[PDB]
Amino acid sequence: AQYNYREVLQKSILFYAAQRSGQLPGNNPIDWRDDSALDDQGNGGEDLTGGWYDAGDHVKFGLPMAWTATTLIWGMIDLANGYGGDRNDAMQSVRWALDYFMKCHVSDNELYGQVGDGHADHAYWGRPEEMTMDRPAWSLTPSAPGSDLAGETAAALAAGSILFSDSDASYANQLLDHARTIYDFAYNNRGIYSESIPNAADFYRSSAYEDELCWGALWLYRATGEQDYMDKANEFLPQGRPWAFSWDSKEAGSLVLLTSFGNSNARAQLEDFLQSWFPGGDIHYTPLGLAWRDTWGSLRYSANSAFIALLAAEEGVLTSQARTFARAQLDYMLGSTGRSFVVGFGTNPPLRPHHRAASCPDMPASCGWDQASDPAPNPQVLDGALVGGPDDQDNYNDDRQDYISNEVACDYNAGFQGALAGILQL
Numbered sequence: 001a002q003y004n005y006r007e008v009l010q011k012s013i014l015f016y017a018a019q020r021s022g023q024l025p026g027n028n029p030i031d032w033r034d035d036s037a038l039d040d041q042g043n044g045g046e047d048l049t050g051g052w053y054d055a056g057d058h059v060k061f062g063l064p065m066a067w068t069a070t071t072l073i074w075g076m077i078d079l080a081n082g083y084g085g086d087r088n089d090a091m092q093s094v095r096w097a098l099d100y101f102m103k104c105h106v107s108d109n110e111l112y113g114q115v116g117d118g119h120a121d122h123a124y125w126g127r128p129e130e131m132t133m134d135r136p137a138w139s140l141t142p143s144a145p146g147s148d149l150a151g152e153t154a155a156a157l158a159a160g161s162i163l164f165s166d167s168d169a170s171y172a173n174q175l176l177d178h179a180r181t182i183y184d185f186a187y188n189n190r191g192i193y194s195e196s197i198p199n200a201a202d203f204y205r206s207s208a209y210e211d212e213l214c215w216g217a218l219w220l221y222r223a224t225g226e227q228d229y230m231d232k233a234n235e236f237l238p239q240g241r242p243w244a245f246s247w248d249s250k251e252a253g254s255l256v257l258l259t260s261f262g263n264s265n266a267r268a269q270l271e272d273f274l275q276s277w278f279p280g281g282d283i284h285y286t287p288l289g290l291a292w293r294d295t296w297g298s299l300r301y302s303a304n305s306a307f308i309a310l311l312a313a314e315e316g317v318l319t320s321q322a323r324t325f326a327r328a329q330l331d332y333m334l335g336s337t338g339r340s341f342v343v344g345f346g347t348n349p350p351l352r353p354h355h356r357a358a359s360c361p362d363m364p365a366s367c368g369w370d371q372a373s374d375p376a377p378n379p380q381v382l383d384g385a386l387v388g389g390p391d392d393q394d395n396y397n398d399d400r401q402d403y404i405s406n407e408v409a410c411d412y413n414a415g416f417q418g419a420l421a422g423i424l425q426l
């Protein structure tokens with residue numbers, strides 16, 4: 001069959017609308033979401049309202065949030081024609097994240113990286129609008145560094161400066177000023193953010209920061225044209241084959257950007273990465289054709305590689321085969337097995353994604369832990385969300401408490417949305 005990729009793209013943007021924290025705008029399209037977490041603030045009282053909730057919880061996790069933003073923005077820049085008439089909506093969508101990063105950047109060398117204690121947050125089940133627990137905020141500073149989180153945040157802001165150049169130059173300038181300063185913080189104060197924010201080490205443990213130092217430098221090079229950023233990127237070049245592209249590992253993305261700038265080693269590395277993911281490579285294929293990387297977030301890992309493949313094909317890298325692979329993977333997510341893995345879309349979509357707000361009945365009814373375990377479909381449809389997905393033999397359970405199957409997250413949708421745009425321009 002053929003799929004309505006544009007409808008999915010539009011729903012993905014609505015997923016991000018459903019993840020908004022803070023004071024929502026009057027044109028909020030999600031009728032079951034309202035103002036929430038209005039007291040989010042730093043240890044000096046600084047306003048930290050806004051941003052996206054990470055997943056089915058209410059924590060603001062800076063590393064996946066920033067990677068999501070960078071990745072979304074990359075598609076809006078380089079796959080603009082595919083976005084087409086939805087591009088402006090997509091731009092306004094990601095502004096929510098960018099605004100929040102700028103608030104997090106309270107001073108030159110202090111960057112808030114988390115709002116919410118993941119344990120306390122996950123102990124609650126209910127609407128974000130009705131939270132009453134303490135929501136601690138943790139920052140990165142020279143004595144508690146995080147080159148990974150800071151480098152990714154810098155990348156997002158630099159990518160944003162490119163995206164917004166033409167339509168909102170004053171905003172783009174603000175974004176780039178913060179990007180430069182945040183990147184200097186990341187480069188000058190080396191460390192793993194989840195050692196500095198220990199709460200995060202239970203949820204988004206960072207494996208390494210040098211890949212964010214390369215990625216952020218590449219984005220700043222793209223945003224400024226200043227050679228010093230290429231020189232910095234060259235200090236941190238990807239080594240070997242990336243395991244995947246994700247919130248944790250930036251190497252495959254850096255390979256695409258490096259290839260775009262004429263780096264020959266990177267282009268060969270990118271070819272070697274892609275061929276492993278194509279059929280008959282080193283990546284496991286399920287019997288129904290999903291390129292399956294890991295137990296957790298299998299659809300996300302495939303979508304992320306589909307996005308890389310589409311962008312690589314724009315550089316003339318394994319062009320046709322890359323596009324064939326991307327389409328096959330997207331088609332698995334949308335319906336090729338006979339059901340959709342995108343909430344609110346297609347044939348037999350997931351009805352019970354693991355998401356607190358979606359699980360709740362309409363206001364003014366109470367919502368609590370009984371809503372986590374109810375076998376009924378979620379009362380609210382989390383349109384657009386890509387679920388965790390199946391195991392290595394295509395088995396999947398639409399159970400709200402099967403975390404492996406039915407997790408939803410900002411990062412799960414980020415490559416996915418761009419890959420939809422990329423397919424739309426073929």
Ligand SMILES: [Ca+2]
Nearest residue numbers: 208209211248
């Ligand atoms: Ca990393």
Ligand code: NA
Nearest residue numbers: 088089090092
């Ligand atoms: Na708009």
Ligand code: NA
Nearest residue numbers: 192194195196
């Ligand atoms: Na250590």
Ligand code: NA
Nearest residue numbers: 239240241242
């Ligand atoms: Na490596």
Ligand code: NA
Nearest residue numbers: 280281282283
């Ligand atoms: Na093989």
